[PDB]
Every structure is written in C-alpha cells, then in structure tokens.
Symmetry: D2
Subunit: 230 residues, 4 copies
C-alpha cells in the first residue's frame, strides 16, 4: 500500500518524517539504535498509523539483512524509502582527525545507505509505479569548506550514487532523489526538521512519471563565501 | 500583494505558469513576442485574476526597460519573477552551425534573462521576505550531449548566475531558484503543467527557505554514459 | 605545421602564451584591439617566429569573419586555438550593476569565444590529429561568491560549451580543454607565465589524449565555505 | 627531500608511476597485496633508485599504521603520495549486486585512501613547500552511467575529499590534486598507464606556489552520449 521505511527515525530529520507520513496514514517501518526513544515514538505514532519499530544499526549488514528478510507480508511491496541515518563526527582538520570517527561516518553514511537500499530494492521494484527513494545528502557534498573532509566526501558519494542508481532502474517505475539540505537547527532561521519532512512528503507524492533527481535547499540566510587566501 | 512577472508567457512553460498562478489569484504581468496569442490568454485569465499583457522581446534592452518603468503602482513591489523566455535552435554539430542561431540563443537565454532580472530586482527587493525568482535552466546546463553546444552553455550560465545572485541578496529576503527540467512534451515526458506546479511550490516556500536548484526528469529519462568513436 | 591563433594577445594570459609558443617556434596569429601594443609584441616576437597580428574586437562578428576568411594559406590548417579574450567589470552587487558592463562581458566572454571557435573550427578540423582548443574558464565558472554574478556565469558557459564541443568533434582528432585558473597576479598568486606553461603542456599532449578540464589555484587559495546573514 | 609513497603499486597506473618516478630518481615506498610481483618490480627499479616494497592491503588499518610507523628515518618528511589503490567490481544493475563487492570497493577506494592519507599526512606537512598528494578519482565520480553505482559514488567521494583536504592544509604548502581518468587500456586508442604516470609527474613537479585542484582526462575517442529514454 502506502508503506514507508525510514532509517535513523530518531536521528536528524527521521522523526519529523515519521510524524508527517503518520499524519498521512502511511504504514511505517522505523529503524533506530536507541530502542527506548524509537519505541516511544512508534507507540505515539501507533495511534494514527501502523508502525513497526526495528532497533537496528544501519552499519550492521547481517542484522539489517535479517530484519528485512523477517518483514511482514504487509511490506512485500514498499512505496517509500528514506535513507536518513547519518552523522558528522569531529572538528579537527583532516591531519589531526581520529580514524575511528572516519570509519563510523563511512560505515553509517555510505555503507548503511547501501545496505538499506540494496536489501529493500526488490520491494521497491515490486511496488513499481510511484515508488520513491529519498537519500539524505547535503550541501557539504558539493561545496568544500574547512573541516568537511570525510562528511562532505560521504555526501558526495550519496549524490553520485543516487544519479547512478537511476541508470539501473529502467522500466521499474522507482524514483530516486538526493535531497541536499544546508544549515539546520536539527536569528538565522535555519531549516527545521519539519521543513525536511514536508519537502520529502512533496517529493514522494510526485506524479508517477516524474523524478526529481536532486533538490538543494538552504535557509535564505545561507549563501556562499567564496575563497580563502592564507 | 501577490504579483507575478513572466517572460515568454506564450512560449514554453510560460502559459502553464500563467494559468496555475491565476488559479491562486496572483496579479500577473505576462510578456511575449506573439501579441495576439498573449492577449487571448490574458483575456481568458482576466476572469480569474488581474492580468497585464506586454508585447515584448526579452532581447530588447530598451523595450524591456521602458516597460518596467511603465508598470502600474500595484507593482511598486513584486512578489515573483519567472524567467522563462528561452529557446534551443537545433542539435547540428557546432562546426556546421549558423552564428545567427547562436546569437539568438545567447541574447534570449542569457541577455534576456539578465535584463528582466536586473530591471525587476529593486521591485523584488522592495517586496522583501517571501519574494522569489525562478530561473528556467535545464539538464543541458550540466550534462553534455551531442549538439548541446550553445543551448547547454546558456543553461550553465543560468545555473551559475542563480547561485551567484544569492550571494548578492543578503538581507533582502529574496529567494533564487534554478529549475532544471529534462525531457518535456511511451516516455511520459514532463508536461508544462508539471513545471507550473513545481514553480508554484517553489514560490510558495515559507519565507525562511531557499531552494537553490531542483533538477527534474521524467522517470523514463536517465544517463547513457559515454560514447567511444 | 605548428600554427596557433590567440584571442586577446595583449590581454590577461595572452601575451605570456604568445611568448611561450614563440620560443617553441609555432607560427602565431594574435588578436588585439590596441593596434600599437599588438604590433609591438608582434614585431618583437617576429625575431623568434612568424607572427600575424590582427587588430580586431572579438565581439565584432563581421570583422572576425572577414579576418578569418583573409587568413594566409599558412593557416589553411590550425594546430592550436587559445580563447583568451575576456574580462570582468566589478564585484558590485547584481541589483545595482550597469547593464552596459553585463552586455560587454557576455559579448566578449561568450560571443567572442563562440565566433572564434566556430569560424576557426574548419581549420582546426583540417589539421586533424593533435589539434587543440584551449578555452580560458575560471574557478568562477564553478564556485559562487559575492559579486561574481555575470563573470562567473560567462565562465560557466565556457565550461559547459567546452565539454559539449567534444561531443560534436568525433573522428576529427581535435581536442578541447577548459582551463580554470584561480587567483592571479604572501599569496604567491598564479603568474601569466604559469598559464602559458600549462597551455603549452596541454597543446603538446599526445594526440590520443584529451584533457577536458584542469582547475588550478595558487596553493594559498582554497574555499571559505558558507556565509550566513543574521 | 624527494620521497614517494605509492599504494597499489604492482601493475596499474601504479607500476607505471613507480617506473616513471624511478627515472627521476625519487626514493620509492611501494605498497601492494601481490608480494612477488611487488618484489620483482622493486628489484628491477633498485638499479635506478632507492625502493622499499611493503606488502599490504590498504583496507587493513592496523597494518597500514604499523607499516607507516615502521618507515625508515629517510621518510621523516614525505614529498609525494599517490593514492592509487582502488577497484571496480563490475557493471551489473545495483538491484542484483553482491554487498561483498560493495564492501570491498568502499573499504579499498574510500577507507584505504583515507588511511594512507591520514597516516602519512604529518610526514607530508613535515616536508612542507612542494609536497603533493595525488588522489586517483575518475570520470565516474562526475558522470553517471549504467552499473556505475558504487564505483562512481566512491570516486565522487575521492573528488570532494580532495577539495576539502585543501581547506585543512592552509599554511602547510602541501598540494592536493584529484586526477580523473577515463577509458584506460585495462581502435579507441585509450589512456595508457604511462600517460597517467606522465601526468602525475607533471602534477607533482609543479612550482610550489601552484595547486592543480583537478584534471579530468579522457582518450579523445571518448565523450558523452547524453540521455537514455526507456
């Protein structure tokens, strides 16, 4: 039916997405490491829609494959997938960074999204016309700045991956979108999680024949600084 | 007030946008080369909203500038500008092309856009918060293909100008968006009404949000990769 | 024969390129609006190599078309074209710019390069294997910043036009390169001689190779990231 | 101070680079999984320069770090690093790919690159003015195509990481270049590994004040096909 899988559903924009699509009565599968926060959200949203909470680390390939294999028949076809699970770690310039932080970002922001995408593609294919993948990219995937190193690289991966995935999805009906948000809260009036939630709702309800390849959104307060000279 | 200026309002996605924003009751200035067709649309939409048809070619700096000065006072402030006037003049190999055609495209797709945006900018700035410029770019602005030459060049101009313009508009509230459509009308291509819907959504964005760019293809359209000769 | 056409040979990186290719013994066609300055450079380099100075404005399609039609037989084939004529006219905010300035920039930076390329292309094609077009782009074609508006726009045109041109030139042997310099003449900025050297290397690439784009900045120059207005 | 560390050295652009720099007499650290092929190459080049072959998988973080900390005092400063280790594992549609291959490409092309660059970065900074890092990206990092999926994402990661790195290295003198090759030999007259080696040599021998941000190079026989409509 209208079924949606959201990774990191207590992380970043995941909760706001969960709330927005619950308001619309989509069936939800919500992924989260924090079992207690996830489960409370599921319980709350359970009053307006069907929710299946899965306590799960997207880095964990085996657990993710087990979770997907064990999905109820309700989800034999999947309408939506939001790849939201991701994080930025550290402050240091690249040369004094902790490789532990770099591993975690790569495993989460890239491998996590690859696992959730590959494992769920057959169900997205099976839905067909109107199916939608929304990947959480970032302005950091395009525009370099100090300290961005791996986080930006990670988001640049996501951007190209989305475009590339569309080249493999011929005749399938499945859409793919890279949403690239700028400065969030989540007097500058930053993007709010509910703004991301509304935008993804709009993206996923696009007429079956249309694919938004990419959409870069910033607060109007945010623009580009140009170059630094040392 | 909700006021909208549209270049090439008879030409591309211009009519669809005119119709779509009339439904929402925005007051419309519509420009076009084809006077009879421009006036028939204005006459038709005048039943739903205020419309001002302006017969002009966006390439003509003096005519555009005169027309802007002569706008009625309801437009002392301007909410939206859709820079939609633009054309492609074939996909011949560059080495065989006619420089007149290349002239027409530069003057229309770049200069026409520049004139409309600069002349109207102070009115958009006067409106402030909530104001939006939508430039019509194209997928041709970033993806090379045989025969793209000048059309694609002009659309990459539009893309970069859009982003650049935002760096100049700090503190004004004015928003700038580059909309980049792919294949339009078994492909189920993009319909003009889809672009009209998309622009309405961009222009109605909450004041604090700026959609920098939005690339849209029909789902049937993807990338072919590389050619080897 | 090693024949080279250089637009704006007394502007920007143009003189440095004429000198560099002069010492390598290529025959030069050099354009410039200022006749005396152009002929002095032509006179001087005449001791090292054959030089044809043409006094013309690249915006002038008719002048440009007549000059190319009147090229001596030495130039029945063209090895190299450097599209170097171009200028900026401020970093004044867009809303307050002079449309005269903006007109001048697109006529020069865009149409000038268009007329150049189109009128000479049959001669470059007649040369065939090893022929080279080098367009002067800029970091401005890619990275947005305050007051860049039209100049960056023009340089983005140049970038896309370069790549696009390649798609029409199959079977011809002709190469096209977009060179994108940053800060030029503490900071140790790019020197005109650095550009001459890099264009020399580009035009002498083995015939089977095409450098699509090459972005060069002084090492003192990087990216500042975003600006937020409060 | 003229030392070079090359990852994936035994057969690729890798071997070509080792051989090219050996002619110039740079002192070589060569990294490779294939011990015997690696040792034979070091033995051959020991006639021309100092070589140190290190048997290693760039994916293995503990081994890379143990290898780096165990380098002779000769490499207390490091002049150049070529991050060349990387692989594609086929062109099948994403929905039918094996996640093992995706792990392998992310671990090698991203993580491997990140380990060698973080671990050696303090040695590159110690050298300072004139030091160069050359990452091997690809046309795939920028241009989508069927079956590109993870490989292209991986190369988009490399490009953005390259540019981001420059923002962290202000004041050090260290240069970072993303090189983006197209169709290679591994009647189209494709890029030969010796061409890659030639271009990296030109990059690394650049005047100290200059940074080549990126250089995309295709065989002239290669261009863009545009769009597919299903």
């Amino acid at each position: 039916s209208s079924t949606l899988f959201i990774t990191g559903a207590t992380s970043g924009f995941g909760e706001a997405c969960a709330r927005r699509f619950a308001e619309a009565g989509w069936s939800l599968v919500l992924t989260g490491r924090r079992e207690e926060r996830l489960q409370a959200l599921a319980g709350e949203l359970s009053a307006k829609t069907r929710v299946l909470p899965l306590t799960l680390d997207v880095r964990d390939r085996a657990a993710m494959s087990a979770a997907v294999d064990n999905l109820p028949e309700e989800f034999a076809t999947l309408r939506g997938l939001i790849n939201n699970a991701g994080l930025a770690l550290g402050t240091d310039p690249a040369q004094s960074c902790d490789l532990d932080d770099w591993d975690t970002m790569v495993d989460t922001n890239i491998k996590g999204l690859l696992y959730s995408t590959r494992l769920l593609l057959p169900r997205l294919i099976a839905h067909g016309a109107g199916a939608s993948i929304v990947n959480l990219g970032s302005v950091a995937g395009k525009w370099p700045y100090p300290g961005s190193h791996v986080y930006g690289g990670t988001k640049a991966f996501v951007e190209q991956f989305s475009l590339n995935l569309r080249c493999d999805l011929q005749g399938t009906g499945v859409r793919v979108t890279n949403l690239e948000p700028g400065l969030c809260e989540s007097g500058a009036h930053p993007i709010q999680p509910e703004d991301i939630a509304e935008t993804i709702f709009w993206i996923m309800n696009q007429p079956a024949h249309l694919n938004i390849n990419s959409l870069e959104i910033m607060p109007v307060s945010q623009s580009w600084a140009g170059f630094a000279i040392h």
